[PDB]
PDB file of C-alpha atoms in Angstrom:
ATOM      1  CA  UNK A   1      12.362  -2.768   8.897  1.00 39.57           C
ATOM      2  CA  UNK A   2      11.118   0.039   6.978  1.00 41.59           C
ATOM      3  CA  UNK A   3       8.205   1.023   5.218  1.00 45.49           C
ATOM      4  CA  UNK A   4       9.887   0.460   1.932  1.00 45.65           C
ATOM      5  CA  UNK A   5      10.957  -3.150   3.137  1.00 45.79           C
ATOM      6  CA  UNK A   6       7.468  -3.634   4.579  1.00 44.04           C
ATOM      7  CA  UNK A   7       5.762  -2.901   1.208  1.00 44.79           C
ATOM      8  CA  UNK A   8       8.319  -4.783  -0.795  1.00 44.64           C
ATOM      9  CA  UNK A   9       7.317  -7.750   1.486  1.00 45.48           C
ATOM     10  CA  UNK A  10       4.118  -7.353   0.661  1.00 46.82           C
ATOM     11  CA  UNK A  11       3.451  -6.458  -2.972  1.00 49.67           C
ATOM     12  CA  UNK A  12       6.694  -8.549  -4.183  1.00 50.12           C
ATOM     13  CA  UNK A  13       8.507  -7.968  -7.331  1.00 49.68           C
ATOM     14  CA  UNK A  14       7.776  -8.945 -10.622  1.00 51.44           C
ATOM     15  CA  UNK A  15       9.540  -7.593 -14.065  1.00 55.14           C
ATOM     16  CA  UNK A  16       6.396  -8.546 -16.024  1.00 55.10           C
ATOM     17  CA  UNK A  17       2.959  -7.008 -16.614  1.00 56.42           C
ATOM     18  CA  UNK A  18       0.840  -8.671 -14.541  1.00 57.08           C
ATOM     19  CA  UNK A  19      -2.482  -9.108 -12.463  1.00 59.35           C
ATOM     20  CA  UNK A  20      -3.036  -7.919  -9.215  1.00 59.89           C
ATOM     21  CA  UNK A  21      -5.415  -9.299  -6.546  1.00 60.61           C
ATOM     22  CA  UNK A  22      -8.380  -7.717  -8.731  1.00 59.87           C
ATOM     23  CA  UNK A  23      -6.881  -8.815 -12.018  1.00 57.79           C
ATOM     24  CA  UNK A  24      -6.172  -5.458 -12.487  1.00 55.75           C
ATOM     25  CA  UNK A  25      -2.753  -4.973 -14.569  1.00 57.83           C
ATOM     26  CA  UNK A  26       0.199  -4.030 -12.760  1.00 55.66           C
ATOM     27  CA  UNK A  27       4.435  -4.545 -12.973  1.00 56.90           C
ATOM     28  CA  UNK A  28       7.389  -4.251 -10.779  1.00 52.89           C
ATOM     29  CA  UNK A  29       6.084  -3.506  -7.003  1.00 53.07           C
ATOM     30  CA  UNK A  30       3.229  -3.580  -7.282  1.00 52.50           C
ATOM     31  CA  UNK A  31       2.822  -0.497  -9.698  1.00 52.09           C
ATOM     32  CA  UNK A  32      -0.712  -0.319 -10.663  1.00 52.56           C
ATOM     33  CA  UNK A  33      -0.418   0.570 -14.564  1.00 52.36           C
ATOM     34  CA  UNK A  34      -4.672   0.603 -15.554  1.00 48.51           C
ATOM     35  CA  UNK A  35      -7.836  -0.233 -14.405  1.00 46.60           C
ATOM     36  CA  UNK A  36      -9.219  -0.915 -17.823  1.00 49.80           C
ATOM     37  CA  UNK A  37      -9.894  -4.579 -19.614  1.00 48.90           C
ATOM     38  CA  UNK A  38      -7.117  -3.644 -22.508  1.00 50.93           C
ATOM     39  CA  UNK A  39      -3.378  -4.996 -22.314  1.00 48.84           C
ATOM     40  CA  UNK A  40      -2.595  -2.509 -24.661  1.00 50.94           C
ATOM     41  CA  UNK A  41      -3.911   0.341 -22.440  1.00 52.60           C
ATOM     42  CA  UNK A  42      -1.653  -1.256 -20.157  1.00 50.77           C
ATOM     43  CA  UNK A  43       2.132  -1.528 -21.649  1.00 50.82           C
ATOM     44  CA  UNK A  44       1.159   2.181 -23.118  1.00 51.22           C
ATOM     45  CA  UNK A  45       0.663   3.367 -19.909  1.00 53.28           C
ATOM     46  CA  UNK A  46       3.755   1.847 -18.615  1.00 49.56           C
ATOM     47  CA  UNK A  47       6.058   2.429 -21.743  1.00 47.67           C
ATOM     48  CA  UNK A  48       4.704   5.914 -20.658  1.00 49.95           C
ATOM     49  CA  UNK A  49       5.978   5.758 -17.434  1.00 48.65           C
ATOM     50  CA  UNK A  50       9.248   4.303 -17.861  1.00 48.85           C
ATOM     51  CA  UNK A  51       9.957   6.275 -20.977  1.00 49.84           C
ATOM     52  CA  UNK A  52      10.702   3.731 -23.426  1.00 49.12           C
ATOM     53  CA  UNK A  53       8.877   1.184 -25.600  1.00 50.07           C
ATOM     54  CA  UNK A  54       9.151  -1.592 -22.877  1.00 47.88           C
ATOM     55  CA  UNK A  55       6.958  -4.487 -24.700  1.00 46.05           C
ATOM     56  CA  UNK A  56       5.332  -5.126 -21.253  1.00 44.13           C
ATOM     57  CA  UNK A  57       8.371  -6.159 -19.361  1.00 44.85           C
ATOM     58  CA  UNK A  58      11.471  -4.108 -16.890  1.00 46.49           C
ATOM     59  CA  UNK A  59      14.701  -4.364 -15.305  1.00 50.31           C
ATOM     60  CA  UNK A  60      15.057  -4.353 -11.427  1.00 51.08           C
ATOM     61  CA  UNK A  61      15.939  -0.767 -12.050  1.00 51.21           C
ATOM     62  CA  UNK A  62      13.052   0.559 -13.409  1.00 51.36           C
ATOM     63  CA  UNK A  63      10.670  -1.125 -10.933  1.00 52.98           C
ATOM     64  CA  UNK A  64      12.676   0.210  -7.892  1.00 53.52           C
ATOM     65  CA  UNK A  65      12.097   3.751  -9.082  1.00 52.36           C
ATOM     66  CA  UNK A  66       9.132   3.045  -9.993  1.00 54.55           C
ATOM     67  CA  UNK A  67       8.874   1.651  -6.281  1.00 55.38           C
ATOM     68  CA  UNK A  68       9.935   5.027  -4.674  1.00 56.73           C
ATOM     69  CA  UNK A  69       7.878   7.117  -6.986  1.00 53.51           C
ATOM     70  CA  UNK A  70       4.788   5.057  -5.821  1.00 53.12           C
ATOM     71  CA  UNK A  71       5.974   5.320  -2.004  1.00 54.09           C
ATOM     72  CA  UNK A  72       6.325   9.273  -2.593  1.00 54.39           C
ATOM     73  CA  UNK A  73       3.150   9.355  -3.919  1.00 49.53           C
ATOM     74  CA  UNK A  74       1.123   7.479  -0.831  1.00 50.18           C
ATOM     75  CA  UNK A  75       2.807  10.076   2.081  1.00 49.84           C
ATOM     76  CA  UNK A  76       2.160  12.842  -0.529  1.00 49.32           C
ATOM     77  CA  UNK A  77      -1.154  11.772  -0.439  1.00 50.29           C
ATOM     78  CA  UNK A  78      -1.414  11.510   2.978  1.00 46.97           C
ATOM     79  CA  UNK A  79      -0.002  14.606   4.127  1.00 44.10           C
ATOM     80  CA  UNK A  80      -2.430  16.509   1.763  1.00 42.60           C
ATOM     81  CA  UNK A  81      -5.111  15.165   3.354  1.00 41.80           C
ATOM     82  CA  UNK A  82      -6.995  16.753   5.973  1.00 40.99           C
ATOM     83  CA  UNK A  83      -7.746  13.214   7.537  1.00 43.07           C
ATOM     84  CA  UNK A  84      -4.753  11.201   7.877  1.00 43.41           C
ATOM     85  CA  UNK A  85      -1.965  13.909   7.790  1.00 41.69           C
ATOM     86  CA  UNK A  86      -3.231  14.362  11.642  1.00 42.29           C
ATOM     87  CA  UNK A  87      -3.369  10.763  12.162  1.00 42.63           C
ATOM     88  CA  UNK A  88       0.074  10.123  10.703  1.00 43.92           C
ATOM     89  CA  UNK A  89       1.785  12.961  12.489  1.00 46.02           C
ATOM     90  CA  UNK A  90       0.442  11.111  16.040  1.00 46.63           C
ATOM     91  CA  UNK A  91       1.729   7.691  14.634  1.00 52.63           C
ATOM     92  CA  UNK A  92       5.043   6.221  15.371  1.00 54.36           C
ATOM     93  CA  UNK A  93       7.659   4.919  13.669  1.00 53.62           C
ATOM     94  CA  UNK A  94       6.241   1.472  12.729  1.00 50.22           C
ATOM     95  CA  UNK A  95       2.448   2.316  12.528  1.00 49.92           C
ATOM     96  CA  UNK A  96       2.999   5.484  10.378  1.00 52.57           C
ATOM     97  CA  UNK A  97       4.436   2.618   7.711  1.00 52.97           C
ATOM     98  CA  UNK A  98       1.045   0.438   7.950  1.00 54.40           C
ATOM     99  CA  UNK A  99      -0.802   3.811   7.197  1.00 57.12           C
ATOM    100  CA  UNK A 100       1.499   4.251   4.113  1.00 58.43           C
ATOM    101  CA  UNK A 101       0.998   0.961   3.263  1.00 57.12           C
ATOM    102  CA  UNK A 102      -2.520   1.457   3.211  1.00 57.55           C
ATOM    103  CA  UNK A 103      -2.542   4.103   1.414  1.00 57.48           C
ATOM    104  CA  UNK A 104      -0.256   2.612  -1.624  1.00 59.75           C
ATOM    105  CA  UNK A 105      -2.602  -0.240  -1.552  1.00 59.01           C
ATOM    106  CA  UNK A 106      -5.723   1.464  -2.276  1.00 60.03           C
ATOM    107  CA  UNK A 107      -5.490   5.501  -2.006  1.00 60.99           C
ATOM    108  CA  UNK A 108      -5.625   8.214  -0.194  1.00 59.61           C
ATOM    109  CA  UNK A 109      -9.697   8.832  -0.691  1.00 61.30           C
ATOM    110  CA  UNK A 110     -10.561   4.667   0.343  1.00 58.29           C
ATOM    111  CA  UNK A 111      -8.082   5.009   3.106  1.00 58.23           C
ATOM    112  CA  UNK A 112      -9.612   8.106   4.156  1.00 55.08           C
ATOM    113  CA  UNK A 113     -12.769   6.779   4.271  1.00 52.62           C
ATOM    114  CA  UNK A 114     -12.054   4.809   7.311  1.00 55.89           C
ATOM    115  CA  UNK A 115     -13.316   7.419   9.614  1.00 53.62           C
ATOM    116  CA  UNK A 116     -14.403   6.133  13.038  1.00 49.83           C
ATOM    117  CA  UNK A 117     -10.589   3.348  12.967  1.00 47.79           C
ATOM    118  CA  UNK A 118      -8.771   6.793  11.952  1.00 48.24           C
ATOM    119  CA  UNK A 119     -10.060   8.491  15.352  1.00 46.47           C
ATOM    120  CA  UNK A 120      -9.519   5.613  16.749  1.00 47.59           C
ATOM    121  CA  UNK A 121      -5.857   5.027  15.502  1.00 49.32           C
ATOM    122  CA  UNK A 122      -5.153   8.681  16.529  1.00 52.05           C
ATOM    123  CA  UNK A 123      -6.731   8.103  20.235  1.00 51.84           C
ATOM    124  CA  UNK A 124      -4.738   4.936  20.714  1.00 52.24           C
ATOM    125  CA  UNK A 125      -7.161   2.520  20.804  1.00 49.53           C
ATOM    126  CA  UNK A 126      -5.463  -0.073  19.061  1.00 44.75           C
ATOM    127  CA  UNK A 127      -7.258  -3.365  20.216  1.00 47.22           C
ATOM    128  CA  UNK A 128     -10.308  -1.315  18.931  1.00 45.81           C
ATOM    129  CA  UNK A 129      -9.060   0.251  15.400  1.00 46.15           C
ATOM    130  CA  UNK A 130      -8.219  -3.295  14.752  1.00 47.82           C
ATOM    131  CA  UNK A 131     -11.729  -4.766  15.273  1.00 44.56           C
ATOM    132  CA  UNK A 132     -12.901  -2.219  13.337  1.00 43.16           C
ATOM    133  CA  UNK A 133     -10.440  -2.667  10.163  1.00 41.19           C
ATOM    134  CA  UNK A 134     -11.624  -6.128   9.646  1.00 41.54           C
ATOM    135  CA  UNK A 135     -15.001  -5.194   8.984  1.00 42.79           C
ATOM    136  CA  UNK A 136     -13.873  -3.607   5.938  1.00 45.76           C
ATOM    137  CA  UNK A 137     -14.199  -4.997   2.107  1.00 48.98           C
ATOM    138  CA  UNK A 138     -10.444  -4.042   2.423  1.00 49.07           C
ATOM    139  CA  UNK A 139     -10.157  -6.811   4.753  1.00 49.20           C
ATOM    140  CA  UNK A 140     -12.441  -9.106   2.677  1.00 49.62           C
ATOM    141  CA  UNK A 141     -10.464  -8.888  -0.519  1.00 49.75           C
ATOM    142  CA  UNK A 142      -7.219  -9.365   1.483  1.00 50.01           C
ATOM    143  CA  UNK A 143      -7.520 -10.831   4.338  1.00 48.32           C
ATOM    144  CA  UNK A 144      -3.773 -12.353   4.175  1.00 51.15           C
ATOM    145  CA  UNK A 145      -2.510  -8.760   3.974  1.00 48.44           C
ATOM    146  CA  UNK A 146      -4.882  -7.114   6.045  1.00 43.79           C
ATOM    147  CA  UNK A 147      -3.995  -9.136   8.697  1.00 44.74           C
ATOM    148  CA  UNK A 148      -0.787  -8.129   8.441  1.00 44.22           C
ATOM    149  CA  UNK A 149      -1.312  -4.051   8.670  1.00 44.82           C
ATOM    150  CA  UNK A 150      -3.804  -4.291  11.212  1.00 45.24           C
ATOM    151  CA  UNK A 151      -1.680  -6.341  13.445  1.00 43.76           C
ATOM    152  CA  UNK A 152       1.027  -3.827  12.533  1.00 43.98           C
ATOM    153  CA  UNK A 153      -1.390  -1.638  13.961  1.00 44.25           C
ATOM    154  CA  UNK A 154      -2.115  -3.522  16.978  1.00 46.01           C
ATOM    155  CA  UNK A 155       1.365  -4.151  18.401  1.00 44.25           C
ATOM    156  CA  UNK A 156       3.302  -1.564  16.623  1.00 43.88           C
ATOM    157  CA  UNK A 157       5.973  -3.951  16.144  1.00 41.39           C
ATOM    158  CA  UNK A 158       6.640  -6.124  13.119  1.00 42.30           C
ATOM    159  CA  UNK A 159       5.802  -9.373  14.030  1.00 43.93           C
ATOM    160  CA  UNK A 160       3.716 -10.145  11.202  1.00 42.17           C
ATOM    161  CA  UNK A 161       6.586  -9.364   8.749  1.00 41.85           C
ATOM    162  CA  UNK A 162       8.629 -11.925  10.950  1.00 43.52           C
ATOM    163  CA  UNK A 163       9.023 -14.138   8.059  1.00 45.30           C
ATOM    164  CA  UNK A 164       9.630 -12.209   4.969  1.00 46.26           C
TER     165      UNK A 164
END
């Protein structure tokens, strides 16, 4: 497992404009395309992004780059940042994919946010950065998924992906 499988296991793949898990409008992997009501705004923005007048749907292909470029961006946007760049460089192998995970789930900034389960991931204290996650709205809205990271998190392993 990697942190590309990890994601792919957990955002899916769809060649179809769609809604995510707040009806926001998204394609592929989970690419977010715009936070606004309009459809329109939407297959713009993504006939932007792919480069062509795409109607509102992809091929495989363009999702899976689409996939990488959104995976670039999350590290990217960790290792900018003053906060998690020093967490990530302490993480290993396994955990340093929940953080990215995190991170392509809701940014950089949210993520960052999670101040005292940060220190905590970078001290160790798994059993206790866990706790601490789930009193999150991040682990309201998704509890399913949440679950998942944190327990990524907690064991380092990936036991929670067992079964994708």
């Amino acid at each position: 497992m990697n942190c590309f499988e990890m994601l792919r296991c957990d955002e899916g793949l769809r060649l179809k404009i769609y809604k995510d898990t707040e009806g926001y409008y998204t394609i592929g992997i989970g690419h977010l395309l715009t936070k606004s009501p309009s459809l329109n705004a939407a297959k713009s923005e993504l006939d932007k992004a792919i480069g062509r007048n795409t109607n509102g749907v992809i091929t495989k292909d363009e999702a899976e780059k689409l996939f990488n470029q959104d995976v670039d961006a999350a590290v990217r946007g960790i290792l900018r940042n003053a906060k998690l760049k020093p967490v990530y460089d302490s993480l290993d192998a396994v955990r340093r994919c929940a953080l990215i995970n995190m991170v392509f789930q809701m940014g950089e900034t949210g993520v960052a946010g999670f101040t005292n389960s940060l220190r905590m991931l970078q001290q160790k204290r798994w059993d206790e950065a866990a706790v601490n996650l789930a009193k999150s709205r991040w682990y309201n809205q998704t509890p399913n998924r949440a679950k998942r990271v944190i327990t990524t998190f907690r064991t380092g392993t990936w036991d929670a992906y067992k079964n994708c």
